[PDB]
Amino acid sequence: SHEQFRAALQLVVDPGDPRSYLDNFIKIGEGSTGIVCIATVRSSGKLVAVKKMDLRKQQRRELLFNEVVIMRDYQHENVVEMYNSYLVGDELWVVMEFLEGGALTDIVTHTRMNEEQIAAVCLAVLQALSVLHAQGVIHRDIKSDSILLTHDGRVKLSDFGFCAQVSKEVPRRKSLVGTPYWMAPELISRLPYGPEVDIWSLGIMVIEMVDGEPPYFNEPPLKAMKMIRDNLPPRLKNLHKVSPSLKGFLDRLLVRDPAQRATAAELLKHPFLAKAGPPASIVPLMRQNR
Amino acid sequence: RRRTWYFGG
């Protein structure tokens, strides 16, 4: 049955073994579904990233097909580019763009972002989401760990292993999927849900960028989920430090009723995003610069 | 904890 799943994934990935062209694998990261390495392309010396996911270590194996559907169908300027996929022994390897700036997590846990920088992140993220949600794709795991940066401060959404599609025949999803602290209240309540859940998770990421941590982060997962399910929307620890503009923005995201929550398309017009700086404005936040 | 969960369906 492992062997049965290996055969199925083989029909879907590219033929071959990229070790035939990559050198010097160095692990740089751990994800929910596997690990991430830098590799050197031997013909040219360029760097790529390689995501390795052990078919035996998955919560749900069939979610590994997510990486193939996104790669094949849903590329965009603010989405990490995937080049090729391979089955190597017991692992799916995806060779992808290397985002040398690392994850937004390393930033929010170590410095303070100003509002120009927060607005730049939110705009980049909302551009990816407007396009994905127009095609019925819901990411379902928006949080700082899923946002990667280039060396020159461009922002890209990554980590689509848990995404799902909605459509006229399947207008909503029912799976309990996400990282507890960032999960939308309707998703925790087990109400069927749609793209609106990424909007709520993005609002929690805005709290990450202001406070450094999502709400209830010191509470065990389950307890945090109960409180998200049952309490009023969570508040910034530092409400006093955010502009009225940023506050009114967040109030469009952390709306408990999914019907009243802003859509990505609507949030691209919010006046808070007018503060968005260029990618250069993100650069000084990165570990090699701060 | 920052780990993603999957349990529904």
Author numbering:
A (entry chain A): 300 to 589
B (entry chain B): -3 to 5
Paper passage:
The DFG+1 Phe residue in these WT PAK4 structures is positioned within 4Å of the Ser phosphoacceptor β-carbon and oriented perpendicular to the substrate peptide backbone. Indeed, in the structure of WT PAK4 in complex with PAKtide-T, the bound peptide is in a nearly identical conformation. However, to accommodate the Thr phosphoacceptor residue, the DFG+1 Phe undergoes significant conformational movement: it rotates ∼75° about its β-γ bond to allow the face of the Phe aromatic ring to interact with the Thr methyl group. This conformation for the DFG+1 residue likely interferes with positioning of the γ-phosphate of ATP. Consistent with the kinetic data, the structure does not suggest impaired PAKtide-T binding to the WT kinase. Rather, decreased phosphorylation of Thr substrates may occur due to conformational effects within the catalytic center.
Most kinases in this group, including those in the mammalian Ste20-like (MST) kinase family, are Thr selective (Miller et al., 2008), while members of the p21-activated kinase (PAK) family are Ser selective (Rennefahrt et al., 2007). Here we show that a residue located in the kinase activation segment, which we term the “DFG+1” residue, acts as a major determinant for serine-threonine phosphorylation site specificity. As previously observed for WT PAK4 in the absence of bound peptide (Eswaran et al., 2007; Ha et al., 2012), in each of the structures PAK4 is observed in the active state conformation with the activation loop phosphorylated on residue Ser474.
